[PDB]
Structure 1
Amino acid sequence: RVRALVYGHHGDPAKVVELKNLELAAVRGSDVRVKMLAAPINPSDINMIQGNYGLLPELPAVGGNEGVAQVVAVGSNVTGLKPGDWVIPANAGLGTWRTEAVFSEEALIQVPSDIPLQSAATLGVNPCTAYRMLMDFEQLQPGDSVIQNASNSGVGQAVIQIAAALGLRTINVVRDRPDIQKLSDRLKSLGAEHVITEEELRRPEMKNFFKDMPQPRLALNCVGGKSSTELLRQLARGGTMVTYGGMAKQPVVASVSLLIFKDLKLRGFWLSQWKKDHSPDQFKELILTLCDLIRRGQLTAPACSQVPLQDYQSALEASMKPFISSKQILTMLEHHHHHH
């Protein structure tokens, strides 16, 4: 009776993902039966399906790496999860775009159920990525600056909020658009100090434009090409640019002068590798940290369009969009307002 979004081959998700009926496994001693409640469509999910990603589950595969589920049944040896608990995947690759599944308890992390459901559904990827990038590369103190691009993305909005919660001052690059003023005010209300366009970023002058803030030692990039070079250019001598997303045909470009004379560092960050390298308990501590930020009103989930699993086609469609209408989240529960 399980309904799932399964791809049999790599390609355009719009074309290769289909809604199939699977049957449930048996609940072994250390297994957990879950009912998925919600699961976002994230760039990494799209890349997995397209076949350009560092982790590519065996085909045919279930789409999605992130989501929150409710524990329904547990195996005879399990003492640390109970019916009713909320859980999220311990790492990528699990396949979250479905109604029900049976997972080893070690594959799951309990999340408090007092936070909003949509927050739990999106806690495990974007906020974790943001927090990790802010902590793991440069030691930042209150008053220090951070610059990033794609600032309106899931990670970008989480960086704004978490950076603000850390007392950091953000310069947030976005793409040029007609409703820039509205976007700017919105990001500022999440805590952004300044919001600038890629066009502004490219100006020679702009490097020393915001006189009343320190040069950033950390830059967060997911765009690449010339844009990534312009982000680099904004760094203080010895600073680091961390790349956490992008495209195959838009490599990161670093001028020889910036590497040599400005002693800049280029790094990557991959949350799945972090999770692989660390214990479930260490990931749980990160989750609890973020849960506290949520309860303290220091982190809130972005604007989301809830789409029933059945209408997944339109949800995929929307997340492909260059200027993404609004984040898409697949929901397996009926809400107070029906969505046809």
Structure 2
Amino acid sequence: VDLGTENLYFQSMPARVRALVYGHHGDPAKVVELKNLELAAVRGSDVRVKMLAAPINPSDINMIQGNYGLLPELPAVGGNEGVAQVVAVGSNVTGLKPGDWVIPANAGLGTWRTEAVFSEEALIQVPSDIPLQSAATLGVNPCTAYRMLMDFEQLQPGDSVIQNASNSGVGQAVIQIAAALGLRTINVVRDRPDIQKLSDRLKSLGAEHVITEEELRRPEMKNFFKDMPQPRLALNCVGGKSSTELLRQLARGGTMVTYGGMAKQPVVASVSLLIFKDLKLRGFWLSQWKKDHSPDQFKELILTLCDLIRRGQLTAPACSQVPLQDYQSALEASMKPFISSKQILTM
């Protein structure tokens, strides 16, 4: 599989099954091993799929480390996100057919492998006319972005939204989806030499303002809201003082939604802000959303996002294609504090 192909057809002739498996929780670099697996049987309502591409995401890493809200039984296959082609279907399957592309209906499936047999209900069909890189990353980051923009505060064109980790996959999707919604984004990024290039890139995605964490926390920020309404929504993935400074920007009655961060960097909320500004703090967990909603509700979200991708309104972040056998370097790269390219395992 060549991740960047414009020829979205692939051969699926028989080959050995290989998977990235971990038998203990721990450092992904140490616990994840490439293994051969036996050919599994396709029961009545099962389908056999051939994995095309699967990103390495923070949640994949946290799961392997054992610091996540869902922990598949061990030994487990790594990876929660990816796109696969249906290659065979059980005798009772009528809703998927060979050649269909599918992504997992929820977390926990184990996507870092060449092929697998899954229950039909564990999968969602996705359109096969979108770039592979987009299909591979469709089910997590832009879904999280869309849900947080829709589910917490009622926003209309010209309203503002503030976020941190703006250059992350979710942050870049927030920028693009907010732009399509007519929202005005204030996008906080970590301080970095050569901030200009990053700012230009995020503005090319539709970002209205791009400011560093240092700019966020300095007195001049108090004057930021001439020509710009205060946001009623703040999206956080950083915690600590950064999360407190995001809170400080919210309009009275606003909500800050936390969708990621580190253990030992909790979110910090001043008493004055909670009480006198009546701010709200919430979390968002996409996997719980998927559990709580129908497969059809997830599919509807997917289709909405695909409409955006076809129009060039939702483009994937920079990616590096890595053959499954070269996973070790990809895992190492994915655990750095500054990742320049999303690592995407191909087979």
- Normalising by the smaller structure, the TM-score range is over 0.9
Matched, 1:103 2:122: no
What TM-score comes out, normalization by structure 1 length? 0.97
Offset at 1:281? Answer: 0.4
Measure the CA separation in 2 of the matches of 1:285 and 1:320: 32
C-alpha separation in 1, matches of 2:38 and 2:270: 54
Greater shift in the superposed pair: 173-182 or 196-205: 196-205
> Matches of 2:194 and 2:327 in 1, distance apart?
28
Q: Is the 8 A contact 2:140 2:286 kept in 1?
A: yes
The aligned counterpart of 2:128 is 113
Q: How many pairs are equivalent? A: 332
Cα distance, 1:211 vs structure 2: 1.6
Give the match for residue 142 of structure 2: 127
Tell whether the 8 Å contact from 1:144 to 1:216 is kept in structure 2 after alignment: yes
| TM-superposed deviation, 1:302 | 0.9
Shift of 1:210: 4.2
- How far off is 1:296 after superposition? 2.0
Deviation at 1:207, TM superposition (A): 3.1
Segments of 4+ moved more than 4 angstroms: none
2:83 to 68, 85, 89: 68
Deviation at 1:208, TM superposition (A): 2.8
Shift of 1:31: 0.3
* Cα-Cα RMSD: 0.7
**2:319 aligns to what?**
304
1:325 Cα deviation (Å)? Answer: 2.6
Residue aligned with 1:216, SS: coil
- SS in structure 1 of the partner of residue 102 of structure 2: strand
Which residue number corresponds to residue 12 of structure 2? none
Gaps of 5+ in 1: 333-340
Partners in 1 of 2:82 and 2:341 — Cα distance?
18
- Between stretches 289-298 and 129-138, larger displacement belongs to 289-298
CA contact (8 A) 1:207 1:233 kept: no
8 Å contact from structure 1 (residues 31, 104) kept in 2: yes
Alignment correspondent of 2:262:
247
Per-residue deviation at 1:204?
A: 2.8
Deviation at 1:135, TM superposition (A): 0.1
CA distance in 1, matches of 2:39, 2:166: 40
- Determine the structure 1 residue equivalent to 2:73: 58
Determine helix, strand or coil for the equivalent of 1:128.
Answer: helix
* Aligned 8 A contact 1:24 1:100 in 2: no
Query: Partners of 1:33 and 1:327 in 2: how far apart?
Result: 27
Task: Quote the Cα distance in structure 1 between the aligned partners of 2:80 and 2:194.
Answer: 32
**Matched residue SS, 1:73:** strand
- Is 2:31 aligned against 1:26? no
Alpha-carbon shift at residue 295 of structure 1 (Å):
1.2
**Structure 2: gaps of 5 or more residues:** 1-15
In structure 1, C-alpha distance between the alignment counterparts of 2:180 and 2:145, rounded to whole Å: 12
CA offset digits 1:246-296 (Å, max 9, x no partner) = 011000000000000000000000000000000000000000000011112
Measure the CA separation in 1 of the matches of 2:37 and 2:265.
Answer: 38
**Deviation of residue 25 (structure 1)?**
1.7
Mapped to 2, the partners of 1:157 and 1:137 lie a distance apart of 19
